[PDB]
Design a binder for this molecule. Structure first.
Ligand SMILES: C=C(C)CCOP(=O)(O)OP(=O)(O)O
Ligand SMILES: C=C(C)CCOP(=O)(O)OP(=O)(O)O
Ligand SMILES: CCCNCC(P(=O)(O)O)P(=O)(O)O
Ligand SMILES: CCCNCC(P(=O)(O)O)P(=O)(O)O
Ligand SMILES: [Mg+2]
Ligand SMILES: [Mg+2]
Ligand SMILES: [Mg+2]
Ligand SMILES: [Mg+2]
Ligand SMILES: [Mg+2]
Ligand SMILES: [Mg+2]
Lengths: 362, 362
């Protein structure tokens, strides 16, 4: 509501500072400033801002149940917005490199940045790297003399690294561990032995949950100086859980949601990704169903994709997702309940985060 | 050399720390731990270690004239090495992405990281990103209670951003600035109107000088708690001057130093880089020489590349270089003299940095 407007207003402020500074300190010319402005806008906007708005929400929750002088209310909320944009830009960074890494065509209804007619792949790689650097400029500039600066940055470091590590689990999830070797070329897996719930869970824990859930939540606490007033173990546990469900949704939608609605084009089947559908399929498939899977998965051929998708339809995975959903709903409620004990209001924020995640169709 | 091996010993400490942390905190498996170990070795080792050793030298220079407890001596020298390695991992990061962006084949006598038989481009982009995250994991781990932690991290960020911006100038140095529009396909320059000394200076200042000279020198002062005893404006001026000269050498070597000596294969001509040779050549070429250049520059064909090299030879470009060097000598020497005023030992450290840079053959 008033929350979204404030968040969006801050972007313009952040962008102005960044681009103005490129002029006065970095000798940028008008056309390259425009290039980076459009880059920023394309890769940072048009998402649903779940991450960014979570830190705002968490911050709002503590303001509402307490009393603050108007000045201190604005500092915190502005800080929450800047923090949120740090996260949004960090995802921008990830999505840029990820689309290149996954050979994707579309993101958020437009071409992937690296596929923009005037954008070279080589430049896109560096653009992505600029996006992450931007998070650091904005933290030092806006949070210069904040008590939480050191904790915020340290946490940002840890989360970004966990995500880089997860991306390598993800991007190497179709290879055989025992044949993984920089010196020797290696084909994708034939046995699919490493398509297990445990291995799947580990990829997702790192590539997704830390920066999508833990960071927005804990960052919200940081700007409020309210970390102490929650059971951090619970925050961690609820972030990993909602985070995992989030990625399961993403994996399902990759296959089943029309691009016209999703805003992106699926590549999981073609890239031989250890997705939730593939693992769950191998969890229930008979001998003939497995054999057909192995002969068709991980190949660009549009016909072979249809054989996998057909197999996915026949195995009632759509319904296995419901049984997973139901299970997750129980666990989330359980953790929300446990969060109410020390912080009834943060638990409400987590409830909101959950409902948004639960109800999304992207 | 003894100090070299002492420096390398800290690399083993850092590696062992990173890798052990991946096992105990990141659920890494032995095989991926191996992969990342070899990635680290290939990307971080085999260079001259100029950047890393420079921070060791700076610190050694202050220790010789200052009063410290022996424990404090050991700490400063260990910090020096760790900081040196932060910088070497930062270059590792830049070199991995840069070799992808420039389409290069060889780095430090071996294939570029992305050209390793079992590496692939998509995980190489991420490996590169991992390298930079390591610099931050290092900083936070080894420097946690250090008074210079905030200054070091803040300088590191700015330097990193500077470089990223510089890579953006570099990678778009062959487009007409007016044609720079992400919406519209990007044809290479035909007039070469932007191959001017001032435009060349801008690229180099940002892509090279900050991370190659400024960062290690100031790093040496931070870990030493010796920043107050230098004129920082002098440090900046000398860093940018020696840094530019360093890059000039690199551009010359790209074309003239045989790959067996250089440890890398030149791509500047192929990529249509705004290199020193191109800028200098275009600044003295006659009408026919310009024409033939325009007809052959920026193409992969080895016969084309040969003509540009043939043209460069006839243009007597080693004579422009000797004239550039002779003046750089004057100016560097003048800055070293000025540094002696507040800091004779730092001045001497800059003379050593310069000496090594001046007669490097790769
Ligand atoms: C972490 C994942 C699964 C990438 C997609 O994130 P979103 O679908 O939340 O992307 P936007 O809201 O930013 O578009
Ligand atoms: C080539 C440039 C200008 C980047 C630095 O490379 P170096 O020449 O310092 O490479 P290593 O010593 O790290 O191999
Ligand atoms: C950590 C990077 C997040 N990646 C999410 C993507 P993926 O499913 O993990 O490749 P996408 O489905 O949005 O392209
Ligand atoms: C950060 C940019 C430094 N890269 C140096 C390279 P370039 O000449 O700038 O591409 P190389 O010649 O070592 O490949
Ligand atoms: Mg993807
Ligand atoms: Mg991906
Ligand atoms: Mg996906
Ligand atoms: Mg290069
Ligand atoms: Mg380059
Ligand atoms: Mg070069």
């Amino acid at each position: 509501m008033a929350s979204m407007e404030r968040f969006l207003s801050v972007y313009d402020e952040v962008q102005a500072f960044l681009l103005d500074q490129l002029q006065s300190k970095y000798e940028i010319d008008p056309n390259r400033a425009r290039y980076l402005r459009i880059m920023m806008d394309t890769t940072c906007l048009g998402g649903k801002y779940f991450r960014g708005m979570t830190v705002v929400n968490v911050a709002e929750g503590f303001l509402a149940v307490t009393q603050h002088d108007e000045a201190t209310k604005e500092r915190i909320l502005h800080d929450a917005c800047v923090g949120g944009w740090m996260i949004e830009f960090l995802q921008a960074h990830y999505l840029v490199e990820d689309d290149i890494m996954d050979g994707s065509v579309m993101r958020r209804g437009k071409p992937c940045w690296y596929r923009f007619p005037g954008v070279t792949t080589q430049c896109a790689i560096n653009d992505g790297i600029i996006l992450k650097s931007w998070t650091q400029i904005m933290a030092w500039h806006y949070f210069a003399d904040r008590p939480f600066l050191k904790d915020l940055l340290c946490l940002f470091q840890k989360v970004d690294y966990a995500t880089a590590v997860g991306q390598m689990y993800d991007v190497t999830s179709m290879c055989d561990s025992n044949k993984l070797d920089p010196e020797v070329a290696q084909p994708m897996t034939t046995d699919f032995a490493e398509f297990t719930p445990a291995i799947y869970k580990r990829i997702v824990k790192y590539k997704t949950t830390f920066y999508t859930y833990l960071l927005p939540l804990v960052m919200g606490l940081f700007v409020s100086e309210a970390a102490a007033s929650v059971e951090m173990n619970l925050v961690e546990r609820v972030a990993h859980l909602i985070g995992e469900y989030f990625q399961v949704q993403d994996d399902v939608m990759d296959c089943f949601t029309p691009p016209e609605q999703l805003g992106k084009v699926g590549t999981d089947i073609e890239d031989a990704k250890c997705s939730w559908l593939a693992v769950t399929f191998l969890g229930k498939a008979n001998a003939a169903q497995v054999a057909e899977f192995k002969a068709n998965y991980g190949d660009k051929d549009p016909a072979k994709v249809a054989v996998v998708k057909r197999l996915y339809s026949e195995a009632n995975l759509q319904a296995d997702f419901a049984a997973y959903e139901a299970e997750v709903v129980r666990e989330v409620e359980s953790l929300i309940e446990q969060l109410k004990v020390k912080s009834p209001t943060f638990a409400e924020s987590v409830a909101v985060v959950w409902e948004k995640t639960h109800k999304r169709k992207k």
